[PDB]
A paper describes a structure:
Additionally, to reduce the possible side effects of the rACE2, we impaired the enzymatic activity of the hACE2-T27F by introducing an additional mutation at the R273 position (R273Q), which is a key site for enzymatic activity, generating hACE2-T27F-R273Q mutant. As expected, we found that the enzymatic activity of hACE2-T27F-R273Q was nearly eliminated with no difference to that of the negative control. Interestingly, the affinities of hACE2-T27F-R273Q for all RBDs were similar to the affinities of hACE2-T27F, and both were 2–3 times higher, but ~14 times higher for Delta and Kappa RBDs, than that of hACE2-WT. To elucidate the molecular basis of the binding-enhanced hACE2-T27F-R273Q interacting with SARS-CoV-2 RBD, we solved the structure of hACE2-T27F-R273Q in complex with Gamma-RBD at 2.7 Å resolution. The overall structure resembled our previously determined complex structure of wild-type SARS-CoV-2 RBD (WT-RBD) bound to hACE2-WT with the root mean square deviation (RMSD) of 0.478 Å for 667 Cα atoms. Residues contributing to the interaction between hACE2-T27F-R273Q and Gamma-RBD were listed in Supplementary Table S2, which were almost consistent with the WT-RBD/hACE2-WT interaction, with similar contacts. Due to the aromatic side chain of phenylalanine (F), the hACE2 with T27F mutation enhanced the hydrophobic interaction with Gamma-RBD with additional 11 contacts. Compared to WT-RBD, Gamma-RBD with K417T mutation destroyed the salt bridge interactions with D30 on hACE2-T27F-R273Q, as well as with E484K mutation, which abolished the salt bridge interactions with K31, that both mutations lost five contacts in total. Gamma-RBD with N501Y mutation introduced additional 20 contacts to hACE2-T27F-R273Q and added the π-π interaction with Y41, which resulted in the higher binding to hACE2, that was consistent with the SPR assays. When superimposed the two ACE2s in the WT-RBD/hACE2-WT complex and Gamma-RBD/hACE2-T27F-R273Q complex, the RMSD just was 0.359 Å for 489 Cα atoms, which indicated that the hACE2 structure remained stable with R273Q mutation.
Studies have shown that soluble angiotensin-converting enzyme 2 (ACE2), the receptor for SARS-CoV-2, can neutralize the virus by acting as a competitor of endogenous ACE2 and thus has potential as a therapeutic protein. Other studies showed that a fusion protein consisting of the extracellular domain of human ACE2 (hACE2) fused to the Fc region of human immunoglobulin IgG1 (hACE2-hFc or hACE2-Ig) had long lasting effects, can bind to the receptor binding domain (RBD) of the spike (S) proteins of SARS-CoV-2, and can neutralize SARS-CoV-2 in vitro and in vivo. Here, we generated an optimized, binding-enhanced, and enzymatic activity-eliminated hACE2 mutant (hACE2-T27F-R273Q) fused to the hFc that can effectively neutralize both SARS-CoV-2 WT and several variants.
Author numbering:
A (entry chain A): 334 to 527
B (entry chain B): 19 to 614
């Protein structure tokens, strides 16, 4: 049986980067051939592992993380990077073994009035540890005075929306991202190639 | 957290919501200007109202972070740009009273009608009628009627309103801690806190008057040459030693002398070059013009137009299906969305304004990576100066040959260059005394150096002394001739047209030495010069993030407005005019009047 790659890449709706979705992939035969030769990905960067060679080795557990960010932020989905997305939303480990895949989704995730379905976190008390998720909506205290849950001066709601519109420049257009994490351990390895 | 860290968090929140709301107001404004429907007016006004209300509350919040406690210069400039923008410390009743005055003056200007002495049912507006007379008529009496009646019907209506407008605007300026409304306008050039680059509000007046003193010799000889040619156009109407009558200058006010070219042409047997006929022969369309303008900026190392530019701009009149505002404008909607609004025709003029308007886009694209509040020109004169130098290079015979619009073996006589340079001077040089004198009068009026009982008396004293222009009929204090100009009655600063003109020739001179140009400055084309494109880009990318004195230094190597580059551009004409005025009197007497 084939791996549920079509369920991740061809999904109707992706998650917001602050609530990025993770799917563990196991017990299937992965056909990476349709992936790296699709001609529709603007970013196909692999670290540690090698593309066109993934079809050879078996893997213990394969994780697929997907979300939506804007084009100028795709560079932050890489090891050891800094920015609003890497710091507060989705943090890749410095010693990451896997592939980052991204493609322009303006035709799907943009409405003329503005698509407010996709959010991102703008403030956080600390940076995110690798692969950590924060979906809380607590008022952020920007000053020294307490906020006590009241939104106001120096007290901000931490989530903001992209408002994707099709007339945006490419740097502000929505980009669907899929991060494939690969791990090999002495466990029943059930993610092999053809 | 420190005050500076708190302010940085505040700008992070502000930049996100401001970009969203400004885009929505820009998209609604775009849809109205490309499609005039009542629904689009409502969407434009509501989106604009939402943006104005947002700026007003964010300005009050920005004032809660004291400027003196911020150390980062980029954070200080964003906070200062927000504390001053959206501020309305005027009282409620006085703010509504001022807005009513502003709207009344604007309506009087755009609807004011002048009717023929022969027929009171034959009435002419300024917008298509009086301007046509002042631009094309060769009849002394027809021009005098249009000139005097516009000031008699419309001008006298604005006088009482402009009186209250002065005091109410001065009250608004004192509420923002400026000395008067003139001081408030000059605040655009102010720089505080940067050692070596500072510039005070009073320094602008001295720098404008110092540069203008060096313009006087060139203008005097332009004035003397035009006078002698005008004596033949209107014999027995012009004194050989007096000022030029105000109604014979080519428009309603003498703002530009461009339409006087047909009477003052140096060599009327040599026609000015015009590649309009070459474009139609080679089947050029609007897309080719803008594709050629794109090739020009790419040739100097600047980026191509975005794919959204070609898909979202309006480069032709939509037709009868949509009514559009056909006025060339460059749009920076934010979020990487840049468009040009133009009803382009296949003519040399529209070819040149395409390079002008794309120059704005290149400026907007270059500083897009700046924070939102810094995405503006260095000062109010930088942007149009950037667009003007694109038109300068694109118009040269060197450039037009390079793109196939002029013949490879076309020959440039010095007579055609003098023809070109004089047409330039009538527009460029002729407007500088007009502009300086107009703002000077407004500055002295705002600060109270000219009381209302001497408004018109001082106005025509400076028109005679500075501009060399005399009223054809006397005007008492029931007149308000300044308000007869759009900028004065619609509350718009004017000195930017003076500073921008000096800026543009400072830029072009500096870019042409970077392009290793050898001949006279006016023959220069910066095309295919990577070094010239980099020198300009090192300023364009700054936006408002640095003082305008530093931005000017990155291009011209100097921190101040300088008039020598302008004088160098017109040096071939200056030498020619001096020889033509050997037999004529150079300068003017302020005593002569057409009515005396
Ligand atoms: C997504 O579906 C299309 C069919 O509409 C298919 O051509 C494409 O290969 C699919 N992509 C993946 C990654 O399976
Ligand atoms: Zn312009």
């Amino acid at each position: 049986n084939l791996c549920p790659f079509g369920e991740v890449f061809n999904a109707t709706r992706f998650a917001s980067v602050y609530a990025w979705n993770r799917k563990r992939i196991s017990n299937c035969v992965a056909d990476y051939s349709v992936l790296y030769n699709s001609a529709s990905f603007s970013t196909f960067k692999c670290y540690g592992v090698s593309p066109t060679k993934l079809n050879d080795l078996c893997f213990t557990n394969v994780y697929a993380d997907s979300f939506v960010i804007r084009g100028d932020e795709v560079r932050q989905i890489a090891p050891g990077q800094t920015g609003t997305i890497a710091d507060y939303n989705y943090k890749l480990p410095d010693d990451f073994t896997g592939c980052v895949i991204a493609w322009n989704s303006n035709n799907l995730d943009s409405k003329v009035g503005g698509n407010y379905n996709y959010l991102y976190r703008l403030f956080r008390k600390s940076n995110l540890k690798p692969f950590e998720r924060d979906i809380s909506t607590e008022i952020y205290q920007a000053g020294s005075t307490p906020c006590n849950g009241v939104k106001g001066f120096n007290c901000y709601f931490p989530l903001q929306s992209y408002g994707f519109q099709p007339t945006y420049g490419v740097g502000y257009q929505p980009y669907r991202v899929v991060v494939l994490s690969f791990e090999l351990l002495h466990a029943p390895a059930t993610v092999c190639g053809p | 957290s420190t005050i500076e860290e708190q302010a940085k968090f505040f700008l992070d929140k502000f930049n996100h919501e401001a970009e969203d709301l400004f885009y929505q107001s820009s998209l609604a404004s775009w849809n109205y200007n490309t499609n005039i429907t009542e629904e689009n007016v409502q969407n434009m006004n509501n989106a604009g109202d939402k943006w104005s209300a947002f700026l007003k509350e964010q300005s009050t919040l920005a004032q809660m972070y004291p400027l003196q406690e911020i150390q980062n210069l980029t954070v200080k400039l964003q906070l200062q740009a927000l504390q001053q923008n959206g501020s309305s410390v005027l009282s409620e009743d006085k703010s509504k009273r001022l807005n009513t005055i502003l709207n009344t003056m604007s309506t009087i200007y755009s609807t004011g009608k002048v009717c023929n002495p022969d027929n009171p049912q034959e009435c002419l507006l300024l917008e298509p009628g009086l301007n046509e007379i002042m631009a094309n008529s060769l009849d002394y009496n027809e021009r005098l009627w249009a000139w005097e009646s516009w000031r008699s019907e419309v001008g006298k209506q604005l006088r009482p309103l402009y009186e209250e407008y002065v005091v109410l605007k001065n009250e608004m300026a004192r509420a923002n801690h400026y000395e008067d409304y003139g001081d408030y306008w000059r605040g655009d050039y102010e720089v505080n806190g940067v050692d070596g680059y500072d510039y005070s509000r009073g320094q602008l007046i001295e720098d404008v008057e110092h540069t203008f003193e060096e313009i006087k010799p060139l203008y005097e000889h332009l004035h003397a040459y035009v006078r002698a040619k005008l004596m033949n156009a209107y014999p027995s109407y012009i004194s050989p030693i007096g000022c030029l009558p105000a109604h014979l200058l080519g428009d309603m006010w003498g703002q530009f002398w461009t339409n006087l070219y047909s009477l003052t042409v140096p060599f009327g047997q040599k026609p000015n070059i015009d590649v309009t006929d070459a474009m139609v022969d080679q089947a050029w369309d609007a897309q080719r013009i803008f594709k050629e303008a794109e090739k020009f900026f790419v040739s100097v190392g600047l980026p191509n137009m975005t794919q959204g530019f070609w898909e979202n701009s309006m480069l032709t009149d939509p037709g009868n299906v949509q009514k559009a505002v056909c006025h060339p404008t460059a749009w920076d909607l934010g979020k990487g969305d840049f468009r040009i609004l133009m009803c382009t025709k296949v003519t040399m003029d529209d070819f040149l304004t395409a390079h002008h308007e794309m120059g704005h886009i290149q400026y907007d694209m270059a500083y897009a990576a700046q924070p939102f509040l810094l995405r503006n020109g260095a000062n109010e004169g930088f942007h149009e100066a950037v667009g003007e130098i694109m038109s300068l290079s694109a118009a040269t015979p060197k450039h037009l040959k390079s793109i196939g619009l002029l013949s490879p073996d076309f020959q440039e006589d010095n007579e055609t260059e003098i023809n070109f340079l004089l047409k330039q001077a009538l527009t460029i040089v002729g407007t500088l005394p007009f502009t300086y004198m107009l703002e000077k009068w407004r500055w002295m009026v705002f600060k109270g150096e000219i009381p209302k009982d001497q408004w018109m008396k001082k106005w025509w004293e400076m028109k005679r002394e500075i501009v060399g222009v005399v009223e054809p009929v006397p005007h008492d204090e029931t007149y308000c001739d300044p308000a007869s100009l759009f900028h004065v009655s619609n509350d718009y600063s004017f000195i930017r047209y003076y500073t921008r003109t000096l800026y543009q020739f400072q830029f072009q001179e500096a870019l042409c030495q970077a392009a290793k140009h050898e001949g006279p400055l006016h023959k220069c084309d910066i095309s295919n010069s990577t070094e010239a494109g980099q020198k300009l880009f090192n300023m364009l990318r700054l936006g408002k993030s640095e003082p305008w004195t530093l931005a000017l230094e990155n291009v011209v190597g100097a921190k101040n407005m300088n008039v020598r580059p302008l004088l160098n551009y017109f040096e071939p004409l200056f030498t020619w005019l001096k020889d033509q005025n050997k037999n004529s009197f150079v300068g003017w007497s302020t005593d002569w009047s057409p009515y005396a």
